[PDB]
Every structure is written in C-alpha cells, then in structure tokens.
Predict the 3D structure of the following.
Amino acid sequence: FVNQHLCGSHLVEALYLVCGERGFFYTPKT
Amino acid sequence: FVNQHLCGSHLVEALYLVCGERGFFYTPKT
Amino acid sequence: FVNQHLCGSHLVEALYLVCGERGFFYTPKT
Amino acid sequence: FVNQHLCGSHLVEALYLVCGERGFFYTPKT
Amino acid sequence: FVNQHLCGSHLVEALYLVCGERGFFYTPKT
Amino acid sequence: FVNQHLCGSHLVEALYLVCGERGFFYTPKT
Amino acid sequence: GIVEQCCTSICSLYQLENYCN
Amino acid sequence: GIVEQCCTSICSLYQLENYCN
Amino acid sequence: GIVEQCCTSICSLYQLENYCN
Amino acid sequence: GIVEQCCTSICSLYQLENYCN
Amino acid sequence: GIVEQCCTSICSLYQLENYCN
Amino acid sequence: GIVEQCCTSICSLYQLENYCN
Ligand SMILES: [Cl-]
Ligand SMILES: [Cl-]
Ligand SMILES: [Zn+2]
Ligand SMILES: [Zn+2]
C-alpha cells in the first residue's frame, strides 16, 4: 500500500478501516 | 445535545469529537 | 467533553452531531 | 452534475461543498 | 456554486459528489 | 487487515487510504 | 423537506444550492 | 455494546463519553 | 463568528450548540 | 464490480488495491 | 493536475467534473 | 505515539495495525 500523514479524524477513520471488528485504541497522549 | 444514530465509521467520528485529546477506545462486539 | 480546532467540513460535521434534529446554521461570513 | 442520495451527515458534507463560503442552513423535519 | 481548496480525502469526497455514477479518476501524480 | 463493508462515499475514502499517492479509479456499475 | 428528500429519494446539487445563505 | 447500541437504536454523547481514555 | 470561535480559536461542544436552530 | 461488491457483500483492502493507479 | 488545480489552488465544482469518467 | 508516528511523521497501514486491539 502506501505511507501518508494521517491526522485527527482522518487518523481514527484509518484505524477503523484497518482494525474494524478487532477494535482499536486512539491514545494521542500516547 | 441530541441523541445519536451512528453506524460504522460515523461512530468513530463521534467518539473522536466527544473525547478530543483524551482519545478513546473502539470496541465492537465479536 | 473537550475543546479542539474544528474547521471546514469537520466543523459542520460537529454541528450536525451537536444539533441534529434541531438543525443548525453554518454562516462563516458570520 | 449527478443526482444524489444523501443521508445523515453526508447531506451536511454535500451542503458544505455546494455552498462554500456562503454557508448554509440545515433544517430537518421534526 | 463556489470555489474552495479541496485536498486529500476531501478532494476525493468532492469528486464522488460531482461524478457519482459516471465514476472518476484521482491521479495526484497527474 | 479485516474485510470491509463499504458503501457510497466510504468506498472512496477506503480507496484513498489504500492507494495514497498512486491515486485510483472509481468505477461503479451503470 | 430537503433533508428527507435527499435520503428517502434523490436530490440534485441545484436543489441543495437553495439552502445556501 | 455501545457500537451496536448507537447503530441499532440510539445513543447519547454522554454514553459515548464513557469510552474516552 | 463560528469560524473564529471554533476553527481559528478553540471551542467546546457546548459552544457549538450556539449555532443550533 | 468492486463498488457493488464492497457494499452488497464485503471486500478486502487487497481487492481495493487493484483499483490504484 | 487535480491537486494543483483544486488543493494548491482553488477550483469550482464544474472544474472537478473534468476528472469524471 | 500514534500521532507522532502517523500524523507528525508518516506511517503505513501495517503500522496502523499496531493500535488495533
Ligand atoms: Cl484537514
Ligand atoms: Cl452511511
Ligand atoms: Zn479533513
Ligand atoms: Zn456514511
């Protein structure tokens, strides 16, 4: 595939795409 | 605020807005 | 909840979330 | 342009694109 | 309508809106 | 990666993420 | 209204334009 | 869970807030 | 306006309710 | 096609990748 | 291309139709 | 974290899988 900048809502939309049913955590503080 | 009907990626968008810098966890069933 | 920068389409998506059935106005000229 | 089938937040996205800096009002029934 | 900056995912969302069933190409290399 | 159920503009978002700078073509039936 | 029409049937960008300020 | 509830029924921002870190 | 309050500066979900009908 | 398959059934990122330029 | 016309510069919905099939 | 890896810098879809449950 590719590497791009994914920020904010776009980052979590990408996590949703990638992880789907597995679920995911978005933890920007880290 | 109003009640929400949110499916798929729209749920993740909502969590993103609601949680901000705290981040969040997305955990669907199965 | 939190405070973040909400711009452009993201701003109106947030208005939709917050206002829903009430409806809303987006009037950037002000 | 083509005809549109737009529900939920997708309608707001479309209004945003169509109206630009003029902004718009979102007024659902009930 | 209007003229705005449309970048990234927002650009392809706009192409989807405008083109719909015709389909479209997004070819950033050009 | 997980399998995807993608309709409308969500398909275009997915193509955008998957293809990056290569871009892509969106070609619905009819 | 427009919100319902676009979702239950179809609508055009030209109809949407009526909702601009 | 919340993912299913928001989609099959409705849910509030207050319920969503429970899923923040 | 909304752009100055929420994009240029920073606003809460409560402030966004200012622009509801 | 892919547009219909992803929506009426399911599709993989690997299938989507076929539509890149 | 499209990025230069619509992201870097500014384009109308009509110009975006240039990239339809 | 994820913001540094994928927003500030650049990440692949494979790296994004690092944040799946
Ligand atoms: Cl952005
Ligand atoms: Cl949808
Ligand atoms: Zn964006
Ligand atoms: Zn949707």
The first strand of chain L starts at residue 11 and ends at 12. The first helix of chain L runs from residue 2 to 8. The CA atoms of residues 8 and 19 of chain L lie 16 Å apart. The two ends of chain L are 15 Å apart (CA to CA).
